[PDB]
Design a protein around this nucleic acid. Structure first.
Lengths: 90, 60, 37
RNA sequence: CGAAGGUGUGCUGUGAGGCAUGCUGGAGGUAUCAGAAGUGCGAAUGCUGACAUAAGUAACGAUAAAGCGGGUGAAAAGCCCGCUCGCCGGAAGACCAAGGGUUCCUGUCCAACGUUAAUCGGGGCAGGGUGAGUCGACCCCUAAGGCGAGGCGUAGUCGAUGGGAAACAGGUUAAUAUUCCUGUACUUGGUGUUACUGGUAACAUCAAAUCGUACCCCAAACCGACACGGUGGUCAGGUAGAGAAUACCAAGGCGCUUGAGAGAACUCGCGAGACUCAGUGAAAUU
RNA sequence: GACUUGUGGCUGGUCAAACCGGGAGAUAGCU
RNA sequence: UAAGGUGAUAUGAACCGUUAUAACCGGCGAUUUCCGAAUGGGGAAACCCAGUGUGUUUCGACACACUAUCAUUAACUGAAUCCAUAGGUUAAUGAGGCGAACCGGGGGAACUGAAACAUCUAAGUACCCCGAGGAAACCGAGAUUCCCCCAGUAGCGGCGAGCGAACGGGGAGCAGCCCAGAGCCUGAAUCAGUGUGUGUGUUAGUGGAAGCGUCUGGAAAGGCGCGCGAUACAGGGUGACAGCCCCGUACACAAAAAUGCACAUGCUGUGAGCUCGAUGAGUAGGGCGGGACACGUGGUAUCCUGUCUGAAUAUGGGGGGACCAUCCUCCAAGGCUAAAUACUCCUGACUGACCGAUAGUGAACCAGUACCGUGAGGGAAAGGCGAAAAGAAC
């Protein structure tokens, strides 16, 4: 049961998520590196006590900035578009 | 608190470890990301508590 | 990447005893880039 | 009640010098009797760092064409926006496979980065990461070519751009779609019911991973500083014609990286170059 | 049809024994 | 040790501690990714899939454990081929790692002056491979090696340049063992390994005496007058040059864990004294066929001896600074031997007629850097922050 509690990290809010929230009712949040489609779906049904429809998984490469005279690179984080039905709470 | 749970059995100490992760760990992270977590020291305190409980499980 | 790491990579030198001496100097002089990728 | 060094002057000594004071500066310094060296600098095209003359001059380049209007700003010759005809245009176009891994969208800012300016931007910062069981094929099996315990290539283990269940199209973006919403069609397991004799057919329900994905892709954003060139592969529309020439140089992407007067000889066909001029802005030699 | 693409094998008098490091802070008495 | 902290560059915002649950230092446990010698199969050091066997409030999800080899010991099983042997399974022990200097073993160069020349020196060198170690290997007398001497010697060479020994002595910072052992007698003497307790040390800490004031200057570590201290003035920092305003030194104390050098007791221990014996057989020499020892098979000593053969124990051999002779010792397959001396990549203390940002080390800070090249090799510049940031409200 503890596996489904460490799959999420922090909610992702942006200008694109606010548009699809009032149209298709789909929220997006940042998850960990793992967390397949069977672990993210089972976590929303208990933590958010709401029903979903489809959960997608995709990983993006970390951006590389030019901070000072030393090169730096961040990490890769996975996102997921939590698609809800007609009645949601948050 | 370090020796308070040192005399606890595995089942009950495993349970509080479960509760520490489910509540006050996941919820805190959401609040911090969303920006309504005024006080951040809770994240430090809960993380250390989880480690302290976890080491006792392995030690026991 | 394709025809660059198969002949000039890290595993290309550890497969024989002659290439082991090449990577030995990289350990004493640890640059920012060990091998190309 | 102002050290040494640096920076002036004066005095002293036939040798290289040493001593005093003033200005600047405000923290540790030196002589006599000795000794030990990386030991006093005008050149070896000496090496490093900081700087002249040449010269505010030459130069404005692998070649479609400038000018007029309006808006923003203290400042608009050149940037942004709008209208008409002709230079580009089966390719100086777009979509895949590499390299690169946030250079593509938005907002703010103009020091550096860019052959001038550059309020723009391909610059910096912030906001904003690109929806996938039916987008591409992974795993496994097979051919050529390899590997292959013994022996000195057999039995096996492996290796696809073909054969390998599916979806052809449209709408919706400020930036990226064939996916989510809506309408339709097809296939492969498990479970429950019915029919036929575990298998088949009809109806319903549940489950099905990871990686890649934008911009660039025929020369601008990538590799020789002036496309002083090299550069894989896919699609030959409508009319006319025997064909891929020619004819309507169609539609779309858009229309040299920068101005104003004058307009020899020579060259190319009143124009296009050269020379003299705002601004910006060099090397060799000595 | 002497088209094009990918992999592997055979052939070392300019990739046909290039550069750097060690020998070597070597070594030409003249310049 | 409790009157403070959440490393530094580098501040703010956010918390904890106050009549004993803060932080920092030391010791004893649990815990301690993918990937890199990486062993399940490939491979690109961070791309992709785990195979088999249990338990499980989850017959659809996870975590943990075991398996590329070779060699040794024990148990079990098994072909050609009746016995033996190869292969396969389980358990235990041992280890296929990388980076200096020095030493040893197996291989192996050029350039300088050479009268001339494949004579020679330089040079059993630089560098590189495998493995091991903590350092390596005619006056006398039989562990061994290194340093200090004999000694730029007595010799050797177209006696050209070079290369190159020993005994004695001056210096002892050496400590000389076990087996071939039957019999009367064993848990002996001398010692080692593995536990506990006491005493003495090493590796983290605390207590620890000693200058009060005035003039000048914004500020006093120096000056004048009067004292304390001194087993302690070794050095550096504390607004200008500091014993006594701080941080370090005499003296006096502590042991929950681990380790090293003498001593009580216990278990397993290759084992002495006295008496009765012995002092090391496939060897030397000779014959046939090769190579390495400077020497082409020489006038040729010594070292190594595959295959086919073969003696002796004062009736055989070597040595006494080597003709022949004499007396004593020695006369073939055993097993061991510390420290000092070699070597300086890491820690703490201490030292200097070395240096102070073109010096010293590529590199005094974000130097094994930015940048360049297919990879490897090779390879720059840059602090003079101020005592305290008082680093400009309007």
């Amino acid at each position: 049961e503890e596996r489904l509690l460490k799959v999420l990290r922090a909610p992702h809010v942006s200008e694109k998520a606010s548009t699809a929230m009032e149209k298709s009712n789909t929220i997006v949040l940042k998850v960990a590196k793992d967390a397949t489609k069977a672990e993210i779906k089972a976590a929303v049904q208990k933590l958010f006590e709401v029903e979903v429809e489809v959960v997608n998984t995709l990983v993006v490469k970390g951006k590389v900035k030019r901070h000072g005279q030393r090169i730096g690179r961040r990490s890769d984080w996975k996102k997921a578009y939590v698609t809800l039905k007609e009645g949601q709470n948050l | 608190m370090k020796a308070k749970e040192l005399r606890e059995k595995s089942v009950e100490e495993l349970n509080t470890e479960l509760l520490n992760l489910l509540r006050e760990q996941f919820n805190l992270r959401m609040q911090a990301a969303s920006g309504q977590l005024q006080q951040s020291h809770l994240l430090k305190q809960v993380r250390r508590d989880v480690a302290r409980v976890k080491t006792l499980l392995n030690e026991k | 990447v394709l025809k660059r790491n198969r002949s000039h990579g890290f595993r290309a030198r550890m497969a024989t005893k002659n290439g082991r001496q090449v990577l030995a100097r990289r350990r004493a002089k640890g640059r920012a880039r060990l091998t190309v990728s």
